[PDB]
From a paper:
Dopamine receptors are a family of G protein-coupled receptors (GPCRs) with five subtypes, which can be further divided into D1-like (D1R, D5R) and D2-like (D2R, D3R, and D4R) subfamilies based on their sequence similarities and G protein coupling specificity. Upon activation by dopamine, D1R undergoes conformational changes and couples to the intracellular heterotrimeric stimulatory G protein (Gs), which in turn activates adenyl cyclase and elevates the level of the second messenger cyclic AMP (cAMP) level to drive downstream signaling processes. Dopamine D1 receptor (D1R) is an important drug target implicated in many psychiatric and neurological disorders. Recently, a class of non-catechol D1R selective agonists with a distinct scaffold and pharmacological properties were reported.
Here, we report the crystal structure of D1R in complex with stimulatory G protein (Gs) and a non-catechol agonist Compound 1 at 3.8 Å resolution. D1R is in a fully active conformation, featured by an open conformation of the cytoplasmic end of TM6 and active-state specific conformations of DRY and NPXXY motifs, which are conserved throughout family-A GPCRs. Compound 1 binds to D1R in a fully extended conformation, with its uracil ring directly interacting with ECL2. This results in a distinct conformation for residues 186–191, the part of ECL2 between TM5 and the conserved cysteine residue in our D1R structure. Another important interaction contributed by ECL2 is through the side chain of Leu190, interacting with both the uracil and furo-pyridine rings at the ends of the extended Compound 1 molecule, with Leu190 alone contributing a large complex interface surface area of 73.7 Å2. The furo-pyridine ring sits in the orthosteric site, where endogenous dopamine is predicted to bind. Another noticeable feature of the Compound 1 pocket in D1R is the presence of Trp3217.43 at the orthosteric site deep in the receptor core. Detailed analysis revealed that Compound 1’s furo-pyridine ring interaction with side chains of Trp2856.48, Phe2886.51, and Phe2896.52 on TM6 of D1R is likely to be the trigger for D1R activation. An aromatic element of the agonist, through interaction with two aromatic residues, Phe2886.51 and Phe2896.52 on TM6 of D1R, initiates the conformational change of the Ile1113.40 and Phe2816.44 of the PIF motif, without the requirement of hydrogen bonding with Ser1985.42 and Ser2025.46, or the inward shift of Pro2065.50 on TM5. There is a continuous density observed in the groove in the crystal structure, which can be explained by a Polyethylene Glycol 400 molecule in the crystallization environment.
Residue numbers in the entry:
A (entry chain R): 1003 to 1162, 21 to 164, 185 to 241, 262 to 346
B (entry chain B): 1 to 340
C (entry chain N): 1 to 128
D (entry chain A): 10 to 62, 68 to 96, 108 to 145, 158 to 173, 176 to 241, 245 to 380
E (entry chain G): 6 to 62
């Protein structure tokens, strides 16, 4: 198919308001008139046929894009300047010409007379050289090199680009995640000395967790990234629960391993005595119990397609029960651990200084690595999972499309969704570089 | 009355006699003879079975006469008996002392000996009592940690300790039958002869000394190495043996020649020797190092026949079976490894 | 065998100097940390000096620190100790001992006179 | 065929012994091992163990036990070198080298007939004539002076304090050649190394055991197989090194020239009533030991200097706190957090 | 005074080690090499053994 407008404008299945502009819906479609909020819904329903309260199906967007393209080509053919170029250039450059006629209108493309004569004379390189140094490629350079390249080369390599960049960007991530996690899942069994390590009973769980994200959560939102249309109807209702579960499992396994490290550092005797494999496994399982108690509650609290946020009393509460308290208690445990580490670095430095005092007839260098190795884990965790939650707790409070708080629209929020999801890929690089893990991974590649 | 002076002069003349005797008996070397023989087949064995179970570091073992049973002792204070075929440990037995250093399996398969820092050789009736193995004997101590005890029959054993004195015992009466007091360092390794009429002990004196179970004296002596001898083993003929010490080399000493023969070492090795063995024929010499790796050498061309690696820790012991089928090894990572 | 022969010694008035030497054979002298060991009549064995495998660490006993000078030649396989400012409390028999472990920094040479890597030392006294 | 049931019985024995050995591993992983060397008496480890704990019985039990073995050994060695004493001597020969049997009450009745026969160790005639003194007893001095028991190999004591199992052991009766038996100590949690100062020295022998202690500590610290274990270093004879220093009565300056220009650290905590001239010397030795401890430290093993206090109840507390610090530092090095 | 017992018991121990006939290496190594050359067929370690003779596979 063409889908040239699906990458420059995007498929917005819902009506989105502007700052000062009037309401719009569909694909680059300006709902004329309608100064009131209810007035644009009537226009949408009259244009779609069905009772459109704002919800437009995936095919009605294309059906309306076809009518918009028909109106645009009629307005371009009625215009005298833009008439001969249609028959001069082939169907490939017709896409770029209709794109220009739809973006700046039929009166804007007519003002480019020299480039019009260049394209009429069947000269592509000169037309590109003339159109590059213009006020059209300086204001929107992202959509420029996508249509000048198509008009110059005359093939489909200009639009294969965005699709293939995204395809590779997600494929490398998914391969890295899945393979780097299954390597740990296989090394915890294929090697013996690493199986009898109860302190790792909480890491393997994480592995399993961060692998369920890679197989059961990643591909669905991945195939949802063509241009904004997915073959999922009522399946998102069961996929959002999958995502809540797979994110809660990891968000709580991190807290479990942090509390485990705190208990192992604070009380060594009590740790090596009261930490049995049975207690370890019940600690493994309680996090998943909470994950299924928070996620798999389909009492219609999530539906209040696939493009709206969650309920207020559900989002602001699931974030507290799933993220806020875990992150707070994790900060507490790690600061206490750092305080103990400082307490003993003090004694070690005192002994070293008293021994240097033997010089009668390196100082703060360990502090750097301590703060570094704590800040790596904690800062990676928080920078990955904190903007997502502090924005998910505030965004459902947006009425219409104008507000003073963050209230950021859906594109940057989806970017942050994937940004927070990518921390599952960094789990094993931070939690699974023991020397034994390194030897196992080196043996797995030979 | 100036008797000590004449005695010392006679002793010095005697000591000088052996030098000329060995110089007259050393007309050639083994390299000049083994030039015509074709090189050894390059052999790299593989780990057929791994025997897990021990909690701490193992220290010694001994192949059974049936090429199936192994006896391994760890620092956890428990000796376990293996079945190399099924990899199925038949039973374990705890100890009175947690620190054990040497094992011994009877040639008949009836008794099992244990020694360590407890200065006590504990013999156990493996097959008697009609049930769990019981403590049969606790041989008297002699101010030295047992480094190697071996069985020549079921009626008497031979032990070596760190007091620079070996002892051939009598298990029935549980007393010292013959005492051997001809060393200046810790007596570490023993190895009986095919006829069980004599043995050679390797100690920390950088010397291997041949003894005799009958008269209880030293017939010959070998002072080739540079550091503390750790392991020793007879050529399967009773006319020569091999010694391995901390100087990172293994040396072959013949009896009828009373002189060193060949030295086995490389330049890129520094790790001392921990265990030396042969094969059934005696052409391959198996030597465990401290570089977490052991090497199979040629006992006739001093060339590294191959390497045997797979232990993440230092290897502690190694032994060949009766029919030369398997080479068991054992490292301080609680792991035995059978090779073939 | 591994022989270590010591030379020198003898009678000298207190306050004088005396150099003594140790010639070792039977092993690679170049790669072994060596040292000396004194024994006073009627007293246990005592430590004085140390040489690394190259001449790096030259540890002394505080009772002789900065007074005796020790060196060695790996080419000739020899090791020398020179006592300057000899005191009447240094009258003893001196042995040339060596550490057993090749390429290591651990040593266990002082014993109850059963250590094998240590030859018969030389006698040194003072006059009156 | 019939081999299947045999293989399954072998597998069942395997499962039983493995179920036992899993719990044995669980137990062994929770006991911290401590090595005590330096003193010339193993009883120094039995006193501190008697302040809490089978050691609560009187010391007469062990001494009386070392009296029931001398007679057995003598009667077994005297009759082995040779009317109706066949069945009476067969039981005695079968009771030879029996650890858990010792001497039954019916053994004296069978031994008195053999001792009364006119035909029938160095000290063997004194502990054999009074074979009728058996009771339950209360030995005399002339009997303990003649008893010569062989050197006890290793004094091994496994106790449990504060809900954690400790395994403390003293190594005695061995030779002064400490080369190949120290290797057997790698799974140990700590080596408690005790040091003494000068003695009476009055006819001064002048052995200089302190420098020998430095050399042994340098050989143990820089050992290839002891690089992960830690040393808790105690300085005994703190009272003997206090009244013997004074102002010029201690020959510590003659054995260490650096002691002259040495100063007392500012972070020191002298005991209330300690003179500066003795406090400086008391800290000089720990500074000299830490000069070796602070070097070659790869963050993998440390040292814990502590002065031997008078109250025997707080040395155990020092040891316990040091073990806690050892476990903590090991765990911090595990996660690359230190 | 002088220990005329430790050194007196060693002169005969040393003299008993020199009255033994010592065969030359040219003849002591022939029958030593012939042993491992004539019994190479009995040692299965000189080549890897197949599954037909390996009780460990
Ligand atoms: C807003 C949102 C949040 C989310 O993650 C969570 N939601 C609640 C609690 C949570 O705890 C951890 C993670 C997490 C997963 C999916 C979506 C979502 C998106 C991105 C969308 O485009 N359309 C849509 O309908 N939904 C529901």
């Amino acid at each position: 198919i063409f889908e040239m407008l699906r990458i420059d404008e995007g498929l917005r299945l819902k009506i989105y308001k502007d700052t000062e502009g009037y309401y719009t819906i569909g694909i680059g479609h300006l709902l004329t008139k309608s100064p009131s909020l209810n007035a644009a819904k009537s226009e949408l329903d009259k244009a779609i046929g069905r009772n459109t309260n704002g919800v437009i199906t995936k095919d009605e967007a294309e059906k309306l894009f076809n009518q918009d393209v028909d109106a645009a080509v009629r307005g371009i053919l009625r215009n005298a300047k833009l008439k001969p170029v249609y028959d001069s250039l082939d169907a490939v450059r017709r896409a770029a010409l209709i794109n220009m006629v739809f973006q700046m209108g039929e009166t804007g493309v007519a003002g480019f007379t020299n480039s019009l004569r260049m394209l009429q004379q069947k000269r592509w390189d000169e037309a590109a050289v003339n159109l590059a140094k213009s006020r059209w490629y300086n204001q929107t350079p992202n959509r420029a090199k996508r249509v000048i390249t198509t008009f110059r080369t005359g093939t489909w390599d200009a639009y294969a680009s965005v699709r293939i960049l995204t395809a590779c960007f997600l494929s490398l991530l998914i391969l890295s995640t899945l393979l780097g996690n299954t390597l740990v899942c296989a090394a915890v069994i294929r090697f013996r000395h690493l199986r009898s390590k109860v302190t790792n009973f909480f890491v393997i769980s994480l592995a399993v967790s961060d692998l369920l994200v890679a197989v059961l959560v990643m591909p669905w939102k991945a195939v949802a990234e063509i241009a904004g249309f997915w073959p999922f109807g009522s399946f998102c209702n069961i996929w959002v629960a999958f995502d809540i579960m797979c994110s809660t499992a990891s968000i709580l396994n991190l807290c479990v391993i942090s509390v485990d490290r705190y208990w192992a550092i604070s009380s060594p005797f009590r740790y090596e005595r009261k930490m049995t494999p049975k207690a370890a496994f019940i600690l493994i399982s309680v996090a998943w119990t909470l994950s299924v108690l928070i996620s798999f509650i389909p009492v219609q609290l999530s539906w209040h397609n696939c493009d709206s946020s969650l309920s207020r009393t559900y989002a602001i509460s699931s974030s507290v029960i799933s993220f806020y308290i875990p992150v707070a208690i994790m900060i507490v445990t790690y600061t206490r651990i750092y305080r103990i580490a400082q307490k003993q670095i003090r004694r070690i430095a005192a002994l070293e200084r008293a021994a240097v005092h033997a010089k009668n007839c390196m100082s703060f260098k360990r502090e750097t690595k301590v703060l570094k190795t704590l800040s790596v884990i904690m800062g990676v965790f928080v920078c990955c999972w904190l903007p997502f939650f502090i924005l998910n707790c505030i965004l459902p409070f947006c009425g219409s499309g104008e507000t003073q708080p963050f209230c950021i629209d859906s594109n940057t929020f989806d970017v942050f969704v994937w940004f927070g999801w990518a921390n599952s890929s960094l789990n094993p690089i931070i939690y699974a570089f023991n020397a034994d893990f390194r030897k196992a991974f080196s043996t797995l590649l030979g | 009355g100036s008797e000590l002076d004449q005695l010392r002069q006679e002793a010095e003349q005697l000591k000088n006699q052996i030098r000329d005797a060995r110089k007259a008996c050393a007309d050639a070397t083994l390299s000049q003879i083994t030039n015509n023989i074709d090189p050894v087949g390059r052999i790299q064995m593989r780990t057929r079975r791994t025997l897990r179970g021990h909690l701490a570091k193992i220290y010694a073992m001994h192949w059974g006469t049936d090429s199936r049973l192994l006896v391994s002792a760890s620092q956890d204070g428990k000796l376990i008996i293996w079945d190399s075929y099924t990899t199925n440990k038949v039973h374990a037995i705890p100890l009175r002392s947690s620190w054990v250093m040497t094992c011994a399996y009877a040639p008949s398969g009836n008794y099992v000996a244990c020694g360590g820092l407890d200065n006590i050789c504990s013999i156990y009736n493996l097959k008697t009592r009609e049930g769990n193995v019981r403590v049969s004997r606790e041989l008297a101590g002699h101010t030295g940690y047992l480094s190697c005890c071996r069985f020549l029959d079921d009626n008497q054993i031979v032990t070596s300790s760190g007091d620079t004195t070996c002892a051939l015992w009598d298990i029935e009466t549980g007393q010292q039958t013959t005492t051997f007091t001809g060393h200046t360092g810790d007596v570490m390794s023993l190895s009986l002869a095919p006829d069980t009429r004599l043995f050679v002990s390797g100690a920390c004196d950088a010397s291997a000394k041949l003894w005799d179970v009958r008269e209880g004296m030293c017939r010959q002596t070998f002072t080739g190495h540079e550091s503390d001898i750790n392991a020793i083993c007879f050529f399967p003929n009773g006319n020569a043996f091999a010694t391995g010490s901390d100087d990172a080399t293994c040396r072959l000493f013949d009896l009828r020649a009373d002189q060193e023969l060949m030295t086995y070492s490389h330049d890129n090795i520094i790790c001392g020797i921990t265990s030396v063995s042969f094969s059934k024929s005696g052409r391959l010499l198996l030597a465990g190092y401290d570089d977490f790796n052991c090497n199979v050498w040629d006992a006739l061309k001093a060339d590294r026949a191959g390497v045997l690696a797979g232990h993440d820790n230092r290897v502690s012991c190694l032994g060949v079976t009766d029919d030369g089928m398997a080479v068991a090894t054992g490292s301080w990572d609680s792991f035995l490894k059978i090779w073939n | 065998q591994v022989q270590l022969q010591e030379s020198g010694g003898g009678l000298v008035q207190p306050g004088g100097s005396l150099r003594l030497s140790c010639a070792a054979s039977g092993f690679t002298f170049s790669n072994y940390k060596m040292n000396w060991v004194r024994q006073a009549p009627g007293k246990g064995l005592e430590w004085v000096s140390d040489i690394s495998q190259s001449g790096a660490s030259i540890s002394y006993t505080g009772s002789v620190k900065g007074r005796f000078t020790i060196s060695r030649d790996n080419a000739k396989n020899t090791l020398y100790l020179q006592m300057n400012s000899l005191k009447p409390e240094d009258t003893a028999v001196y042995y040339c001992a060596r550490c057993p472990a090749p390429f290591t920094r651990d040593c266990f040479d002082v014993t109850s006179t059963t250590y094998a890597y240590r030859g018969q030392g030389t006698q040194v006294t003072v006059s009156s | 065929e019939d081999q299947r049931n045999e293989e399954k019985a072998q597998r069942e024995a395997n499962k039983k012994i493995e179920k036992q050995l899993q719990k044995d591993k669980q137990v062994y992983r929770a006991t911290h091992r401590l090595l005590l060397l330096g003193a010339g008496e193993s009883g120094k480890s039995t006193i501190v163990k008697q302040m809490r704990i089978f050691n609560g019985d009187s010391e007469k039990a062990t001494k009386v036990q070392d009296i029931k073995n001398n007679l057995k050994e003598a009667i077994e060695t005297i009759v082995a070198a040779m009317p109706e004493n066949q069945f009476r001597v067969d039981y005695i020969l079968s009771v030879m080298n029996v650890p858990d049997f010792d001497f039954p009450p019916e053994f004296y009745e069978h031994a008195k007939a053999l001792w009364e026969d006119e035909g029938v160790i160095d000290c063997a005639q004194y502990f054999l004539d009074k074979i009728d003194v058996i009771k339950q007893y209360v030995p005399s001095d002339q009997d303990l002076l003649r008893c010569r028991v062989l050197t006890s190999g290793i004094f091994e004591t496994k106790f449990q304090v504060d809900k954690v199992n400790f395994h403390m052991f003293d190594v005695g009766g061995q030779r002064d050649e400490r080369r190949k038996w120290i290797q057997c100590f790698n799974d140990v949690t700590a080596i408690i190394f005790v040091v003494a100062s000068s003695s009476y020295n009055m006819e001064d022998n002048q052995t200089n055991r302190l420098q020998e202690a430095l050399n042994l500590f340098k050989s143990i610290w820089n050992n290839r197989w002891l690089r992960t274990i830690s040393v808790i270093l105690f300085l005994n004879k703190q009272d003997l090194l206090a009244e013997k220093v004074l102002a010029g009565k201690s020959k510590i300056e003659d054995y260490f020239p650096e002691f002259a220009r040495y100063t007392t650290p500012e972070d020191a905590t002298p005991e209330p009533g300690e003179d500066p001239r003795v406090t400086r010397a008391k800290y000089f030795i720990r500074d000299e030991f830490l000069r070796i401890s602070t070097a070659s430290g790869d963050g993998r093993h440390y040292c814990y200097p502590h002065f031997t206090c008078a109250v025997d109840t707080e040395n155990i507390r020092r040891v316990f706190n040091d073990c806690r610090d050892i476990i903590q530092r090991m765990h911090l090095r595990q996660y690359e957090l230190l | 005074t002088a220990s005329i017992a430790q050194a007196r018991k060693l002169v005969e121990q040393l003299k008993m080690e020199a009255n033994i006939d010592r065969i030359k290496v040219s003849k002591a190594a022939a029958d030593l090499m012939a042993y491992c050359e004539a019994h190479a067929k009995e040692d299965p370690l000189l080549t890897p053994v197949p599954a037909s003779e390996n009780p460990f596979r």
